[PDB]
């Protein structure tokens, strides 16, 4: 940049990828993969087949791939992340609140560094932490070591509300608790009829 900065443009972080997706020809890269697919060696063709599977979806559907890079993150309504009061006087909140709070804390600090004109090393190292925070909010533990809460317990992300046996699908949609029901011990009754 100090020498030939007039000739090229580079960047770091996520905003750079946002620029690469913008400076990307969907139809050309799709047909370029097709040309490789029509006549190619299976060793290097299978790797181009699966690429077309991703690119062709963005081409036909009409939705831009830019959605993979976020400028704003949505906040789930509070009753789905409720904060309850305890009989000891203190409180207890969902782990989603601590993840949203950490994203808010680091995003406001980044706004301070941008305003102050702080050195690029602080702003870039701050932008990295905001990436890890949103990554923790959506799927904590996916990359690297998870954000531990008090007691080395991994915080539950938004995607943890849908995963596995404890997720929303299996725990609250495929099976539910029902009214007008009961349970007791069973005892054999010979005098009873089969019905």
């Amino acid at each position: 940049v100090d020498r030939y900065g007039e000739y090229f443009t580079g960047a770091m972080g996520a905003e750079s990828i946002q620029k690469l997706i913008e400076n990307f020809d969907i139809d050309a890269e799709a047909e370029s993969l097709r040309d490789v697919i029509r006549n190619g060696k299976g060793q290097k063709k299978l790797r181009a087949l699966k690429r077309l599977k991703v690119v062709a979806a963005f081409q036909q559907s009409g939705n831009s791939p830019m959605g993979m890079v976020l400028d704003a993150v949505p906040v789930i309504p509070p009753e789905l992340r409720p904060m309850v009061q305890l009989d000891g006087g203190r409180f207890a909140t969902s782990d989603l609140n601590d993840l949203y709070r950490r994203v808010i804390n680091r995003n406001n600090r980044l706004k301070r560094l941008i305003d102050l004109g702080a050195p690029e090393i602080i702003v870039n190292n701050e932008k990295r932490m905001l990436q890890e925070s949103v990554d923790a909010l959506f799927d904590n533990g996916r990359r690297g070591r998870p954000v531990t809460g008090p007691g080395n317990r991994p915080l539950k992300s938004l995607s943890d509300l849908l995963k596995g046996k404890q997720g929303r699908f299996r725990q609250n949609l495929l099976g539910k608790r029902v009214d007008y029901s009961g349970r007791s011990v069973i005892v054999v009754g010979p005098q009873l009829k089969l019905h």
């Binding site: 831009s64 959605g67 993979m68 976020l70 704003a72 949505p74 904060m83 949203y100 709070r101 808010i104």
Partner: protein, 47 residues
């Protein structure tokens, strides 16, 4: 609210769609006030 609707569509949420849903921005990181139990303005529980 009848129970017959054919398709359920899913798609990528534009950053502009996120603003279309949002009833406001969560600026402050605070939650509530630990005396009045009233949520702080622009917090994670802002009324």
């Amino acid at each position: 609210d009848v129970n017959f609707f054919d398709e359920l569509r899913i798609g990528l949420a534009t950053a502009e769609d996120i603003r279309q849903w949002s009833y406001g921005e969560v600026k402050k990181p605070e939650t509530i006030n630990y005396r009045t139990l009233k949520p702080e303005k622009d917090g994670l529980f802002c009324e």
